[PDB]
CSV table of N, CA and C in Angstrom, one decimal:
chain,number,residue,atom,x,y,z
A,165,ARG,N,94.6,-84.6,-112.1
A,165,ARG,CA,93.9,-85.8,-111.9
A,165,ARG,C,93.2,-85.9,-110.6
A,166,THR,N,94.0,-85.7,-109.5
A,166,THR,CA,93.4,-85.8,-108.2
A,166,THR,C,92.6,-84.7,-107.7
A,167,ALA,N,93.0,-83.4,-108.1
A,167,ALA,CA,92.2,-82.2,-108.2
A,167,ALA,C,90.8,-82.3,-108.9
A,168,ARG,N,90.8,-83.0,-110.1
A,168,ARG,CA,89.5,-83.1,-110.8
A,168,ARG,C,88.6,-84.2,-110.1
A,169,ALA,N,89.2,-85.3,-109.6
A,169,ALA,CA,88.4,-86.4,-108.9
A,169,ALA,C,87.8,-86.0,-107.6
A,170,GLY,N,88.5,-85.2,-106.9
A,170,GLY,CA,88.2,-84.6,-105.6
A,170,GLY,C,87.1,-83.6,-105.7
A,171,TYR,N,87.3,-82.6,-106.7
A,171,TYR,CA,86.2,-81.6,-107.1
A,171,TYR,C,84.8,-82.3,-107.4
A,172,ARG,N,84.9,-83.5,-108.1
A,172,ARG,CA,83.7,-84.3,-108.5
A,172,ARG,C,83.2,-85.0,-107.3
A,173,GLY,N,83.9,-85.5,-106.3
A,173,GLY,CA,83.4,-86.1,-105.0
A,173,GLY,C,82.8,-85.0,-104.1
A,174,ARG,N,83.4,-83.8,-104.1
A,174,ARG,CA,83.0,-82.6,-103.4
A,174,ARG,C,81.6,-82.1,-104.0
A,175,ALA,N,81.6,-82.1,-105.4
A,175,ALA,CA,80.4,-81.9,-106.1
A,175,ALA,C,79.2,-82.8,-105.7
A,176,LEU,N,79.4,-84.1,-105.7
A,176,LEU,CA,78.4,-85.0,-105.2
A,176,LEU,C,77.8,-84.7,-103.9
A,177,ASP,N,78.6,-84.4,-102.8
A,177,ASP,CA,78.2,-83.8,-101.5
A,177,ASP,C,77.6,-82.5,-101.4
A,178,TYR,N,77.9,-81.5,-102.3
A,178,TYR,CA,77.1,-80.2,-102.5
A,178,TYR,C,75.8,-80.4,-103.1
A,179,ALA,N,75.7,-81.2,-104.1
A,179,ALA,CA,74.4,-81.6,-104.8
A,179,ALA,C,73.4,-82.3,-104.0
A,180,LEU,N,73.9,-83.3,-103.2
A,180,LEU,CA,73.0,-84.1,-102.4
A,180,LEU,C,72.4,-83.2,-101.3
A,181,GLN,N,73.2,-82.2,-100.8
A,181,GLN,CA,72.7,-81.2,-99.7
A,181,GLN,C,71.8,-80.3,-100.3
A,182,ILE,N,72.0,-80.0,-101.6
A,182,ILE,CA,71.1,-79.0,-102.2
A,182,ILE,C,69.7,-79.6,-102.3
A,183,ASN,N,69.6,-80.9,-102.5
A,183,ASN,CA,68.3,-81.6,-102.4
A,183,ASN,C,67.8,-81.7,-101.0
A,184,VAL,N,68.7,-81.9,-100.0
A,184,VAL,CA,68.2,-81.9,-98.6
A,184,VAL,C,67.6,-80.6,-97.9
A,185,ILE,N,68.3,-79.5,-98.3
A,185,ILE,CA,67.8,-78.1,-98.0
A,185,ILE,C,66.5,-77.7,-98.6
A,186,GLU,N,66.2,-78.3,-99.7
A,186,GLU,CA,65.0,-78.0,-100.5
A,186,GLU,C,63.8,-78.6,-100.1
A,187,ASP,N,63.8,-79.9,-99.6
A,187,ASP,CA,62.8,-80.6,-98.7
A,187,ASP,C,62.8,-80.1,-97.3
A,188,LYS,N,63.9,-79.8,-96.7
A,188,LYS,CA,64.0,-79.3,-95.3
A,188,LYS,C,63.3,-77.9,-95.2
A,189,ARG,N,63.5,-76.9,-96.2
A,189,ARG,CA,62.8,-75.7,-96.3
A,189,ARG,C,61.3,-75.9,-96.5
A,190,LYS,N,60.8,-76.8,-97.3
A,190,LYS,CA,59.4,-77.2,-97.4
A,190,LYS,C,58.8,-77.8,-96.0
A,191,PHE,N,59.4,-78.8,-95.5
A,191,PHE,CA,58.8,-79.7,-94.4
A,191,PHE,C,58.9,-79.1,-92.9
A,192,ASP,N,59.9,-78.3,-92.7
A,192,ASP,CA,60.0,-77.7,-91.4
A,192,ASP,C,59.1,-76.4,-91.3
A,193,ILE,N,58.8,-75.8,-92.5
A,193,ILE,CA,58.0,-74.6,-92.4
A,193,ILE,C,56.4,-75.2,-92.5
A,194,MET,N,56.1,-76.2,-93.3
A,194,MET,CA,54.7,-76.8,-93.4
A,194,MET,C,54.2,-77.4,-92.1
A,195,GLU,N,55.3,-78.1,-91.3
A,195,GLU,CA,55.0,-78.7,-89.9
A,195,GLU,C,54.9,-77.5,-88.9
A,196,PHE,N,55.7,-76.5,-89.0
A,196,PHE,CA,55.5,-75.4,-88.2
A,196,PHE,C,54.0,-74.7,-88.2
A,197,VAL,N,53.5,-74.4,-89.6
A,197,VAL,CA,52.2,-73.8,-89.7
A,197,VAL,C,51.1,-74.7,-89.3
A,198,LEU,N,51.2,-76.0,-89.6
A,198,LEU,CA,50.2,-76.9,-89.2
A,198,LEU,C,50.2,-77.2,-87.6
A,199,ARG,N,51.4,-77.1,-86.9
A,199,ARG,CA,51.3,-77.1,-85.5
A,199,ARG,C,50.7,-76.0,-84.8
A,200,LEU,N,51.0,-74.9,-85.3
A,200,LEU,CA,50.3,-73.6,-84.8
A,200,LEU,C,48.9,-73.6,-84.9
A,201,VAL,N,48.3,-73.9,-86.2
A,201,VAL,CA,46.8,-73.9,-86.5
A,201,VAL,C,46.1,-74.9,-85.8
A,202,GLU,N,46.8,-76.0,-85.5
A,202,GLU,CA,46.3,-77.2,-84.6
A,202,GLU,C,46.1,-76.8,-83.2
A,203,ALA,N,47.1,-76.3,-82.7
A,203,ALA,CA,47.1,-75.9,-81.2
A,203,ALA,C,46.3,-74.5,-80.9
A,204,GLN,N,46.2,-73.6,-81.9
A,204,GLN,CA,45.1,-72.5,-81.8
A,204,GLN,C,43.7,-73.0,-81.7
A,205,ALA,N,43.4,-74.0,-82.6
A,205,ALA,CA,42.0,-74.5,-82.8
A,205,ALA,C,41.5,-75.1,-81.7
A,206,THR,N,42.3,-76.0,-80.9
A,206,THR,CA,41.9,-76.7,-79.6
A,206,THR,C,41.4,-75.7,-78.5
A,207,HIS,N,42.2,-74.6,-78.3
A,207,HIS,CA,41.8,-73.5,-77.4
A,207,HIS,C,40.5,-72.9,-77.5
A,208,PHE,N,40.1,-72.5,-78.8
A,208,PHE,CA,38.7,-72.3,-79.1
A,208,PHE,C,37.7,-73.5,-78.9
A,209,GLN,N,38.0,-74.7,-79.3
A,209,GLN,CA,37.2,-75.8,-79.1
A,209,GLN,C,36.6,-76.1,-77.7
A,210,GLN,N,37.7,-76.2,-76.8
A,210,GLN,CA,37.4,-76.2,-75.3
A,210,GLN,C,36.9,-74.9,-74.7
A,211,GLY,N,37.3,-73.8,-75.4
A,211,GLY,CA,36.8,-72.5,-75.0
A,211,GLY,C,35.4,-72.3,-75.0
A,212,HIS,N,34.8,-72.5,-76.3
A,212,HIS,CA,33.4,-72.4,-76.6
A,212,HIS,C,32.5,-73.3,-75.8
A,213,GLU,N,32.9,-74.5,-75.4
A,213,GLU,CA,32.2,-75.4,-74.5
A,213,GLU,C,31.8,-74.7,-73.1
A,214,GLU,N,32.7,-74.1,-72.5
A,214,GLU,CA,32.6,-73.3,-71.4
A,214,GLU,C,32.0,-71.9,-71.6
A,215,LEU,N,32.5,-71.1,-72.5
A,215,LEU,CA,32.1,-69.7,-72.8
A,215,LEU,C,30.6,-69.7,-73.4
A,216,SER,N,30.2,-70.7,-74.1
A,216,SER,CA,28.7,-70.8,-74.6
A,216,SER,C,27.9,-71.1,-73.4
A,217,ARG,N,28.3,-72.0,-72.5
A,217,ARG,CA,27.6,-72.1,-71.1
A,217,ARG,C,27.6,-70.9,-70.4
A,218,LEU,N,28.7,-70.1,-70.2
A,218,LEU,CA,28.8,-68.7,-69.7
A,218,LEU,C,28.0,-67.6,-70.4
A,219,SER,N,27.6,-67.7,-71.8
A,219,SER,CA,26.6,-67.0,-72.7
A,219,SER,C,25.4,-67.2,-72.1
B,165,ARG,N,13.3,-21.7,-36.8
B,165,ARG,CA,12.3,-22.5,-37.4
B,165,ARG,C,12.4,-22.8,-38.8
B,166,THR,N,12.8,-21.8,-39.6
B,166,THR,CA,13.2,-21.8,-41.0
B,166,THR,C,14.5,-22.7,-41.3
B,167,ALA,N,15.6,-22.5,-40.6
B,167,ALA,CA,16.9,-23.1,-40.6
B,167,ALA,C,16.7,-24.6,-40.4
B,168,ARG,N,16.1,-24.9,-39.2
B,168,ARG,CA,15.9,-26.3,-38.7
B,168,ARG,C,15.0,-27.1,-39.6
B,169,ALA,N,13.9,-26.6,-40.0
B,169,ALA,CA,12.9,-27.2,-41.0
B,169,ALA,C,13.7,-27.5,-42.4
B,170,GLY,N,14.2,-26.4,-42.9
B,170,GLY,CA,14.8,-26.6,-44.2
B,170,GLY,C,16.0,-27.5,-44.2
B,171,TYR,N,16.8,-27.5,-43.1
B,171,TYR,CA,17.8,-28.4,-42.9
B,171,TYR,C,17.3,-29.9,-42.9
B,172,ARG,N,16.2,-30.2,-42.2
B,172,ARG,CA,15.6,-31.4,-42.3
B,172,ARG,C,15.1,-31.9,-43.7
B,173,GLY,N,14.6,-31.0,-44.5
B,173,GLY,CA,14.4,-30.9,-46.0
B,173,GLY,C,15.5,-31.2,-46.8
B,174,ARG,N,16.7,-30.5,-46.6
B,174,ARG,CA,18.0,-30.9,-47.2
B,174,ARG,C,18.6,-32.3,-46.8
B,175,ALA,N,18.4,-32.8,-45.6
B,175,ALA,CA,18.8,-33.9,-45.0
B,175,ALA,C,18.2,-35.1,-45.6
B,176,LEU,N,16.8,-35.1,-45.9
B,176,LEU,CA,16.0,-36.1,-46.7
B,176,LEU,C,16.5,-36.2,-48.1
B,177,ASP,N,17.0,-35.1,-48.8
B,177,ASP,CA,17.5,-35.2,-50.2
B,177,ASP,C,18.8,-35.9,-50.3
B,178,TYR,N,19.6,-35.8,-49.3
B,178,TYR,CA,20.8,-36.5,-49.1
B,178,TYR,C,20.6,-38.0,-48.9
B,179,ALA,N,19.6,-38.3,-48.0
B,179,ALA,CA,19.0,-39.6,-47.8
B,179,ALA,C,18.5,-40.4,-48.9
B,180,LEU,N,17.8,-39.6,-49.9
B,180,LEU,CA,17.2,-40.1,-51.1
B,180,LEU,C,18.3,-40.6,-51.9
B,181,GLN,N,19.4,-39.6,-52.0
B,181,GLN,CA,20.3,-39.7,-53.0
B,181,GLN,C,21.6,-40.7,-52.8
B,182,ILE,N,22.1,-40.8,-51.7
B,182,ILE,CA,22.8,-42.0,-51.1
B,182,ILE,C,22.0,-43.3,-51.2
B,183,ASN,N,20.7,-43.3,-50.9
B,183,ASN,CA,19.8,-44.6,-51.0
B,183,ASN,C,19.7,-45.1,-52.5
B,184,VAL,N,19.6,-44.1,-53.5
B,184,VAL,CA,19.8,-44.5,-55.0
B,184,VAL,C,21.2,-45.2,-55.2
B,185,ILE,N,22.4,-44.6,-54.8
B,185,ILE,CA,23.7,-45.0,-55.2
B,185,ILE,C,24.1,-46.4,-54.6
B,186,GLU,N,23.6,-46.8,-53.4
B,186,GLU,CA,23.7,-48.1,-53.0
B,186,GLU,C,23.1,-49.2,-53.9
B,187,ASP,N,21.9,-49.0,-54.3
B,187,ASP,CA,21.3,-49.9,-55.3
B,187,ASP,C,22.0,-49.9,-56.7
B,188,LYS,N,22.2,-48.6,-57.2
B,188,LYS,CA,22.7,-48.4,-58.6
B,188,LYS,C,24.2,-48.8,-58.8
B,189,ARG,N,25.2,-48.7,-57.8
B,189,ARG,CA,26.6,-49.1,-58.0
B,189,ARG,C,26.8,-50.6,-58.5
B,190,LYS,N,26.0,-51.5,-57.8
B,190,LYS,CA,26.1,-52.9,-58.0
B,190,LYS,C,25.7,-53.4,-59.5
B,191,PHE,N,24.7,-52.8,-60.0
B,191,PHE,CA,24.0,-53.2,-61.3
B,191,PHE,C,24.9,-52.7,-62.3
B,192,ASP,N,25.4,-51.5,-62.4
B,192,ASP,CA,26.0,-50.8,-63.5
B,192,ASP,C,27.2,-51.7,-63.8
B,193,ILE,N,28.2,-51.8,-62.7
B,193,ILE,CA,29.3,-52.7,-62.8
B,193,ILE,C,29.0,-54.1,-63.1
B,194,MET,N,27.9,-54.8,-62.6
B,194,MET,CA,27.5,-56.0,-63.1
B,194,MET,C,27.1,-56.0,-64.6
B,195,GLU,N,26.5,-55.0,-65.1
B,195,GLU,CA,26.2,-54.8,-66.6
B,195,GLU,C,27.5,-54.6,-67.3
B,196,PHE,N,28.6,-54.0,-66.8
B,196,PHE,CA,29.9,-53.9,-67.3
B,196,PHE,C,30.5,-55.4,-67.6
B,197,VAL,N,30.4,-56.1,-66.5
B,197,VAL,CA,31.0,-57.5,-66.5
B,197,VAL,C,30.2,-58.4,-67.5
B,198,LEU,N,28.9,-58.2,-67.5
B,198,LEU,CA,27.9,-58.8,-68.6
B,198,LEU,C,28.4,-58.6,-69.8
B,199,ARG,N,28.7,-57.3,-70.3
B,199,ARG,CA,29.2,-56.9,-71.6
B,199,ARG,C,30.6,-57.4,-71.8
B,200,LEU,N,31.4,-57.4,-70.9
B,200,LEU,CA,32.8,-58.1,-71.1
B,200,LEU,C,32.5,-59.6,-71.6
B,201,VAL,N,32.0,-60.4,-70.8
B,201,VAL,CA,32.0,-61.9,-71.1
B,201,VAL,C,31.1,-62.3,-72.2
B,202,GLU,N,30.1,-61.3,-72.6
B,202,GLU,CA,29.3,-61.4,-73.8
B,202,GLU,C,30.2,-61.3,-75.2
B,203,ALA,N,31.0,-60.3,-75.3
B,203,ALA,CA,31.9,-60.1,-76.4
B,203,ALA,C,32.9,-61.2,-76.5
B,204,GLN,N,33.4,-61.9,-75.4
B,204,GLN,CA,34.2,-63.0,-75.4
B,204,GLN,C,33.4,-64.2,-75.9
B,205,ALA,N,32.1,-64.4,-75.5
B,205,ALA,CA,31.3,-65.5,-76.0
B,205,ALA,C,31.1,-65.4,-77.5
B,206,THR,N,30.8,-64.1,-77.9
B,206,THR,CA,30.7,-63.8,-79.3
B,206,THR,C,31.9,-64.1,-80.1
B,207,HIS,N,33.1,-63.6,-79.7
B,207,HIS,CA,34.4,-64.0,-80.4
B,207,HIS,C,34.8,-65.6,-80.4
B,208,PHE,N,34.6,-66.3,-79.3
B,208,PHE,CA,35.0,-67.7,-79.6
B,208,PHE,C,34.1,-68.5,-80.4
B,209,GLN,N,32.8,-68.0,-80.5
B,209,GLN,CA,31.9,-68.7,-81.3
B,209,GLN,C,32.1,-68.5,-82.7
B,210,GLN,N,32.5,-67.3,-83.2
B,210,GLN,CA,32.9,-67.1,-84.6
B,210,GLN,C,34.1,-67.9,-85.1
B,211,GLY,N,35.0,-68.1,-84.1
B,211,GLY,CA,36.2,-68.9,-84.4
B,211,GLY,C,36.0,-70.5,-84.1
B,212,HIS,N,34.9,-70.9,-83.6
B,212,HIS,CA,34.5,-72.2,-83.4
B,212,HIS,C,33.7,-72.7,-84.5
B,213,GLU,N,33.0,-71.7,-85.2
B,213,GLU,CA,32.0,-71.9,-86.2
B,213,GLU,C,32.5,-72.4,-87.6
B,214,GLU,N,33.7,-72.0,-88.0
B,214,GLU,CA,34.4,-72.5,-89.1
B,214,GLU,C,35.5,-73.7,-88.8
B,215,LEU,N,35.6,-74.0,-87.5
B,215,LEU,CA,36.5,-75.0,-86.9
B,215,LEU,C,36.5,-76.2,-87.7
B,216,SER,N,35.3,-76.8,-88.0
B,216,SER,CA,35.3,-77.9,-88.9
B,216,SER,C,35.9,-77.8,-90.4
B,217,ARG,N,35.8,-76.7,-91.2
B,217,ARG,CA,36.6,-76.4,-92.3
B,217,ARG,C,38.1,-76.3,-92.0
B,218,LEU,N,38.5,-75.8,-90.9
B,218,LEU,CA,40.0,-75.7,-90.7
B,218,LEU,C,40.6,-77.1,-90.5
B,219,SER,N,39.9,-78.0,-89.7
B,219,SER,CA,40.1,-79.3,-89.3
B,219,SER,C,40.3,-80.3,-90.4
């Protein structure tokens, strides 16, 4: 009885974290890419202002 | 009279040729630096040109 009830409470905590990992693997990697593309892009924006005057 | 004359003749050629390299040294290396920042201007502009699509 107590073994079965506890396996089931432990099951609820594994399940819920399996949903947390699934969104964490999406959002941490999506934010990473978007931060990198965003910060690369500004360096060209600012760059070209100056280097087109240098052209 | 041979030695002295033709040494004056040899001295003039040295004079001509040093006089060419003083003007020449500055231009060629300026040209080299021209071609350096040219390729940079050309690289930031290709990357600046699609910046709107990325944004």
